[PDB]
Design a protein around this ligand. Structure first.
Ligand SMILES: CCCCCCCCCC(=O)O[C@H](COC(=O)CCCCCCCC)COP(=O)(O)OC[C@@H](O)CO
Ligand SMILES: CCCCCCCCCC(=O)O[C@H](COC(=O)CCCCCCCC)COP(=O)(O)OC[C@@H](O)CO
Ligand SMILES: CC(C)CCC[C@@H](C)[C@H]1CC[C@H]2[C@@H]3CC=C4C[C@@H](O)CC[C@]4(C)[C@H]3CC[C@]12C
Ligand SMILES: CC(C)CCC[C@@H](C)[C@H]1CC[C@H]2[C@@H]3CC=C4C[C@@H](O)CC[C@]4(C)[C@H]3CC[C@]12C
Ligand SMILES: CC(C)CCC[C@@H](C)[C@H]1CC[C@H]2[C@@H]3CC=C4C[C@@H](O)CC[C@]4(C)[C@H]3CC[C@]12C
Ligand SMILES: CC(C)CCC[C@@H](C)[C@H]1CC[C@H]2[C@@H]3CC=C4C[C@@H](O)CC[C@]4(C)[C@H]3CC[C@]12C
Ligand SMILES: CC(C)CCC[C@@H](C)[C@H]1CC[C@H]2[C@@H]3CC=C4C[C@@H](O)CC[C@]4(C)[C@H]3CC[C@]12C
Ligand SMILES: CC(C)CCC[C@@H](C)[C@H]1CC[C@H]2[C@@H]3CC=C4C[C@@H](O)CC[C@]4(C)[C@H]3CC[C@]12C
Ligand SMILES: CC(C)CCC[C@@H](C)[C@H]1CC[C@H]2[C@@H]3CC=C4C[C@@H](O)CC[C@]4(C)[C@H]3CC[C@]12C
Ligand SMILES: CC(C)CCC[C@@H](C)[C@H]1CC[C@H]2[C@@H]3CC=C4C[C@@H](O)CC[C@]4(C)[C@H]3CC[C@]12C
Ligand SMILES: CC(C)CCC[C@@H](C)[C@H]1CC[C@H]2[C@@H]3CC=C4C[C@@H](O)CC[C@]4(C)[C@H]3CC[C@]12C
Ligand SMILES: CC(C)CCC[C@@H](C)[C@H]1CC[C@H]2[C@@H]3CC=C4C[C@@H](O)CC[C@]4(C)[C@H]3CC[C@]12C
Ligand SMILES: CC(C)CCC[C@@H](C)[C@H]1CC[C@H]2[C@@H]3CC=C4C[C@@H](O)CC[C@]4(C)[C@H]3CC[C@]12C
Ligand SMILES: CC(C)CCC[C@@H](C)[C@H]1CC[C@H]2[C@@H]3CC=C4C[C@@H](O)CC[C@]4(C)[C@H]3CC[C@]12C
Ligand SMILES: CC(C)CCC[C@@H](C)[C@H]1CC[C@H]2[C@@H]3CC=C4C[C@@H](O)CC[C@]4(C)[C@H]3CC[C@]12C
Ligand SMILES: CC(C)CCC[C@@H](C)[C@H]1CC[C@H]2[C@@H]3CC=C4C[C@@H](O)CC[C@]4(C)[C@H]3CC[C@]12C
Ligand SMILES: CC(C)CCC[C@@H](C)[C@H]1CC[C@H]2[C@@H]3CC=C4C[C@@H](O)CC[C@]4(C)[C@H]3CC[C@]12C
Ligand SMILES: CC(C)CCC[C@@H](C)[C@H]1CC[C@H]2[C@@H]3CC=C4C[C@@H](O)CC[C@]4(C)[C@H]3CC[C@]12C
Ligand SMILES: CCN(CC)C(=O)[C@]1(c2ccccc2)C[C@@H]1CN
Ligand SMILES: CCN(CC)C(=O)[C@]1(c2ccccc2)C[C@@H]1CN
Lengths: 557, 557
């Protein structure tokens, strides 16, 4: 009785990651120096894996962990992606709480991020080109220009980060953000407690509104005084950055964040698709729009960065932060220039709130669907189970609504789904292409969509995707950089705590294999066969008909 | 198929609480000023409630949460005591780790707590009366004399508390204590994974060894140079302290810690007693020995405190700490005076290790039995469930093995089982004496032990016990004192965090009643009846035969 389900694909393409995460990853890794790795990972890994995750859930009709009946030893990969989805939900909800606070603050004729006369603002808060306040001048620049009305509003007005000295002194949860976080978790609860398709209104709003706003920002941005300089930066490619490995790791993780692969969302979502649904069309369409949305997102962001650098008399590289709060500074700065700013402020933060809600809904659905498919008891107690998932997320999100929650969020955004998600998607590709068989997988898609995937897809699923995923995983560990939020440098123990979060999900795969073998009764050969054979044909193990014990299985594409 | 089970009662009487917690509670609340409240709470509340908890588990054959089939609305009381048992297990295991470290350090001809020439020792570490090192003299005293070899060894040698400034800067888990904690959780796992009576050797050792060592310490202590002054302090009663409420709250919580009532241990343990077992004899015997053990424990401790004050030229009130590490300073100081100290050091810490292991085993059994009786699935997966309980305890015990884990332990020892345990035992007494009926309870004991409890027990169970429990609960909240470890005063937020821990268990009772009523289907009257009627006669609810809807039920003793 599984609840099987134009604007659908376009809404799926837009995500809090494409509108909030991509901009700062692009800004940090240079404008076009990030596009080259991003497009490569999308075509050789992102799009291929998106098609695999869609087909895996649409053929087995299962969530992230229960699709591993095809190869039992790999259920730890399903538990790992569900843990990653939970970790990301903690700080995703905090981004929605910021949008809710910004929305509530937008209902004023005078927006709070336009001038420096407020209580939160520090003496060091220069009004761009004396826009509102005309005092002194710009005679000094800063590594990160946090002395702008919009920056000061985000840092002091909303986060109260000025009250935290680091991840060692996070402080107490901010009450205004605690109220916003509670509204977010209440909306999330009543959007998931009665099922998966229970919530459709947010999906509809997050299908056209995001594109419309991006278009308005893009058209207005290109006409801003110094937008051209930003456009030039976006177009220029820094080849030296390509030699460095950071851009490649950032691009790969962003691909899985922007597409949703490696969180269990795609498999859980496709578990309710019709068996005949064309995953290939959906993969191509979503990936193509994601590439366009990401490109136009960076163009708009760099146009605003160009104007901001012109208005603040700073260099584009030093005009804004490269953290998770860049869109809460750049977009507010752009809305102010738009006539009828109050209207645009409300419309923009309504879009951010809506986009974040679906993003959090999909992640929590992956956790709920994944665990409910594993334990049918949780399927009959959804309202109670949803409460547990939402409440746990709210409590652990309380760490990021603290005066130093940006430091905790930077840590989570870097380790909750970095090497861990690349390792999980690598294990899934290896599990389906080598242990299960790309040939069997292709026959599965031939049964579902009526055609066997082309050699390009088969080669990517078995060799190209895994090889590139293995390279970025190894490079992530070999060339790991100490975590830093802007000027602040994290204490060494925070990096170890971050690696502990990363390993937490990664260790589930080895631990499950140990558990599966120990829990199995038989000879070492028999136990190994039971762990690699489809759980629908374990009788073949009794008859000694193991395809994985034949060299042709590993020689089949 | 429940696994139904002289030295037994004597071993049950001795506990880490009687040998480790009582001494510092007695020292903090004066010698005999604590005995008066302690003896009162034991006779009017402790012993009466011990008999109720023993009979409740021996008649219903259930753990802390599943015994509430008699009155359904109260299962939150069972969940509350299981949560308290888990909270206490976190820092109980850390006390066992200290005993393991002290045991490993005792295998030397020269004990580490006898002199101040070691690396851990600070310049301020005076050898008592220049015992080992003869330099300078005693010309200044201190609020807490932490400049003694034994004190410095505990604080700097073992805890490394000198590396933490407070609960704000706990630091990293000490690796030597991390190794000791891992051995403790491994021993606990293999003592619980295969059942309840799986471990009997520790029970046998902790039946005579504790008494023997206490006797040796008592006989040697009374002969120590300044022991008389300590004896005089123990005998003297400070009436002004009796007027204060702290001694009463401390005495009441110690009674439930020393007897095991309010952690779910007594009910779970009695669930495996034979139906004919005489709870009354066991209650009288255990309570009588607990009163004697506690009295002689304080006599030995105050005799060592008297000698230490004489040797350190300090006042007994300022000679030692009043925290959870008093026995790791006083007993080491006494062992040193005993000829063949190395032998006595090993024997003493072997006793502490053994006593702690059973204490932790009983608490974890309450959590495992309580949850396994609730969920029969956990009964079939004991080795896996035990792992989860032990592993979770180990991870949360990692907070107390940190350089500032004594601060976390002080917080847990004050809030994990303080007002919360008094509230839980109050709710259990109210639930069985008023909602279920002391008359019904007495008929249950008449069926089990062949006699109806006397009016004294019935009056205590319905009026005396609850009234005194209600008084200490209200007094605990009305006259709460800010937490302080020795000189250190906790930051105000730590007190709120502590009250959050206390309320966590306490809120389970209200939350369960809300859940039970909402989960029940029927009229408000019908739902209320279903929540107060024995779950074996819910047909009476259909026939409108509710004893609790008759005034005589609340007028019956
Ligand atoms: C750092 C943790 C180290 C031990 C943590 C993991 C140990 C043992 C799990 C394990 O391996 O057992 C799995 C079930 O796993 C779960 O529940 C989810 C719990 C995973 C824990 C999340 C960790 C959070 C930091 C049982 O899998 P299964 O036997 O295939 O389940 C089948 C059954 O559900 C329905 O047939
Ligand atoms: C600060 C938490 C606020 C919500 C936390 C509590 C909510 C809802 C529990 C609740 O009320 O449901 C109970 C089962 O409760 C449990 O599991 C233990 C879990 C308790 C959570 C420990 C809290 C740790 C800080 C279900 O009780 P039941 O319906 O009588 O169970 C019968 C079934 O087990 C076998 O028939
Ligand atoms: C299994 C689930 C519960 C794991 C939860 C993971 C997250 C929420 C945990 C794991 C490690 C944690 C961090 C460990 C240590 C510190 C330093 C302290 O000074 C502030 C909190 C902070 C920064 C913690 C924030 C929350 C944290 C990131
Ligand atoms: C078991 C899991 C799901 C939930 C446990 C997480 C709870 C206990 C955590 C999450 C966030 C935490 C809070 C985060 C920050 C602070 C500020 C600090 O100055 C005092 C403690 C306080 C107020 C913490 C109390 C404990 C807390 C609420
Ligand atoms: C611990 C879990 C289970 C639930 C409780 C969450 C706690 C940590 C949360 C919930 C309510 C919060 C408080 C709400 C409002 C205020 C007032 C102001 O001074 C800011 C801090 C303070 C005091 C918050 C501190 C953190 C807080 C106490
Ligand atoms: C904001 C954070 C701190 C807490 C969130 C708690 C939420 C999830 C809780 C608190 C009150 C709860 C509601 C209380 C009562 C009912 C009526 C019942 O027949 C269906 C569920 C429902 C509607 C509950 C759903 C979950 C609920 C909304
Ligand atoms: C726990 C903290 C956050 C308090 C939350 C208060 C609010 C958000 C909660 C408390 C009780 C809740 C209500 C309880 C019962 C119902 C009936 C249900 O069929 C629909 C939702 C509705 C109408 C809930 C809406 C949300 C609600 C009003
Ligand atoms: C068929 C029956 C036995 C199903 C049993 C349900 C079990 C397997 C499910 C239901 C509730 C779940 C737990 C709920 C909450 C937590 C705490 C979290 O920090 C780690 C995961 C953990 C520990 C979950 C593990 C999986 C779980 C234990
Ligand atoms: C946020 C932290 C502190 C608490 C989280 C509590 C969550 C994980 C707990 C509390 C109540 C629990 C539920 C209580 C009862 C049942 C019914 C049972 O047949 C299946 C499991 C299920 C549905 C439990 C799943 C786990 C659960 C939802
Ligand atoms: C620090 C820890 C997490 C390291 C990893 C420990 C893992 C591998 C351990 C912890 C507890 C173990 C389980 C405990 C009990 C059983 C039941 C037994 O009949 C088969 C093996 C099985 C199912 C074990 C499998 C391996 C296991 C899951
Ligand atoms: C449901 C279970 C997991 C609850 C766990 C309760 C215990 C282990 C938790 C709850 C609140 C916690 C404390 C909250 C805040 C601080 C201050 C920080 O600077 C050091 C850790 C310290 C002192 C925490 C230690 C661990 C703690 C006491
Ligand atoms: C879900 C429950 C059962 C387990 C979660 C508790 C874990 C995540 C907690 C318990 C104790 C914690 C540690 C306690 C103290 C420190 C020192 C600090 O300077 C860095 C973080 C570090 C090293 C913590 C890391 C996270 C930690 C290991
Ligand atoms: C997080 C949970 C799931 C498991 C991991 C526990 C972590 C917090 C524990 C386990 C091993 C511990 C480390 C073991 C030994 C050392 C070396 C020395 O410098 C002291 C600190 C340090 C570095 C410890 C810090 C805390 C630590 C990292
Ligand atoms: C010390 C802390 C950090 C971790 C403790 C982990 C313990 C509980 C784990 C680690 C290794 C585990 C063992 C590994 C394998 C087996 C064999 C299996 O057929 C029965 C269970 C048994 C014997 C496991 C019991 C639980 C176990 C001992
Ligand atoms: C996880 C960390 C603490 C490592 C723990 C290592 C030690 C304590 C563990 C690892 C593997 C374990 C062994 C694995 C399997 C068995 C067979 C079982 O029938 C009895 C216990 C025994 C013999 C275990 C004893 C404890 C053990 C040796
Ligand atoms: C009959 C079937 C459905 C039984 C289901 C088992 C459920 C009810 C049991 C088994 C595992 C348990 C969970 C294991 C671990 C945790 C995490 C802890 O922080 C809070 C309690 C919590 C959340 C437990 C609640 C009760 C639990 C969810
Ligand atoms: C210490 C923290 C980080 C992790 C704790 C994990 C614990 C609570 C989890 C991990 C593995 C879990 C078990 C995995 C599978 C089963 C079998 C199922 O039929 C009943 C529940 C049971 C027995 C789960 C109970 C909860 C469990 C023991
Ligand atoms: C902050 C939180 C812990 C406050 C307390 C919330 C409690 C009272 C709420 C949270 C979730 C709620 C449950 C959610 C869903 C259901 C299923 C519904 O058909 C009957 C009520 C029931 C079983 C609710 C009972 C009340 C409940 C347990
Ligand atoms: C963007 C919306 N879409 C595409 C149709 C989704 O699939 C998800 C979703 C679908 C329905 C309801 C809630 C969430 C939200 C996931 C994304 N993480
Ligand atoms: C002191 C020993 N006794 C008395 C017989 C106990 O009941 C417990 C126990 C019994 C058997 C095995 C383990 C633990 C340990 C509890 C105490 N908290």
């Amino acid at each position: 009785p599984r609840e099987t389900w134009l604007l659908s694909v376009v809404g799926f393409a837009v995500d809090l990651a494409n509108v909030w995460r991509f901009p700062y990853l692009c800004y940090k890794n240079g404008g076009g120096a990030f596009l080259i790795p991003y497009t490569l990972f999308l075509i050789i890994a992102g799009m291929p894996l998106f098609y695999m995750e869609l087909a895996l859930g649409q053929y087995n009709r299962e969530g992230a962990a229960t699709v591993w009946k095809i190869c039992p030893f790999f259920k730890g990969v399903g538990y790992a992606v569900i843990l990653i989805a939970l970790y990301v939900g903690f700080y995703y909800n905090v981004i929605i709480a910021w949008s809710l606070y910004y929305l509530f603050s937008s209902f004023t004729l005078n927006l709070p991020w336009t001038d420096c006369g407020h209580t939160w603002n520090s003496p060091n808060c220069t009004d761009p080109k004396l826009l509102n306040g005309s005092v002194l001048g710009n005679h000094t620049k800063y590594s990160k220009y946090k002395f702008t009305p919009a920056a000061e509003f985000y840092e002091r007005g909303v986060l109260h980060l000025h009250e935290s000295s680091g991840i060692h002194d996070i402080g107490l949860p901010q009450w205004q953000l605690l109220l916003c976080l509670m509204v977010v978790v209440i909306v999330l609860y009543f959007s998931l407690w009665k099922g998966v398709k229970t919530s459709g209104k947010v999906v509809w709003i997050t299908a056209t509104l995001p594109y419309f706003v991006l278009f308005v920002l893009l058209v207005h941005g290109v006409t801003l005084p110094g937008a051209s300089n930003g456009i030039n930066a976006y177009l220029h490619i820094d080849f030296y950055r390509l030699k460095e490995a950071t851009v490649w790791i950032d691009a790969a993780t962003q691909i899985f964040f922007s597409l949703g692969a490696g969180f269990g969302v795609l498999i859980a979502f496709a578990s309710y698709n019709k068996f005949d649904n064309n995953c290939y069309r959906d993969a191509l369409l979503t990936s193509s729009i994601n590439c366009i949305t990401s490109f136009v997102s960076g163009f708009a962001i760099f146009s605003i960065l160009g104007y901001m650098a012109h208005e603040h008399k700073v260099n584009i590289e030093d005009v804004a932060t490269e953290g998770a709060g860049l869109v809460f500074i750049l977009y507010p700065e752009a809305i102010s220039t738009l006539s009828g700013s109050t209207f645009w402020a409300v419309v923009f933060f309504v879009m951010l709130l809506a986009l974040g809600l679906d993003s959090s809904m999909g992640g929590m659905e992956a956790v709920i669907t994944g665990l409910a498919d594993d334990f049918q008891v949780l399927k009959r107690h959804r309202k109670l189970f949803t409460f547990g998932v939402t409440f746990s997320t709210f409590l652990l999100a309380l760490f990021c609504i603290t005066k130093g929650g940006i430091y905790v969020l930077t840590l989570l955004d870097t380790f909750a789904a970095g090497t861990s998600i690349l390792f999980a998607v690598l294990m899934e590709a290896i599990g389906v292409s080598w242990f299960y068989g790309v040939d069997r997988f292709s026959n599965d898609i031939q049964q579902m969509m009526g055609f066997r995937p082309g050699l390009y897809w088969r080669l990517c699923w078995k060799f190209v995707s895994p090889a590139f995923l293995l390279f970025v995983v190894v490079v992530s560990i070999i060339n790991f950089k100490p975590l830093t939020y802007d000027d602040y440098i994290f204490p060494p123990w925070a990096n170890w705590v971050g690696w502990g979060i990363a390993l937490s999900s990664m260790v589930l795969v080895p631990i499950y294999v140990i558990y599966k073998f120990l829990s199995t009764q038989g000879s070492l050969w028999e136990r190994l066969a039971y762990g690699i054979t489809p759980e629908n044909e374990h009788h073949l193990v009794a008859q000694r008909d193991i395809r994985q014990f034949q060299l042709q299985h590993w020689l089949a594409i």
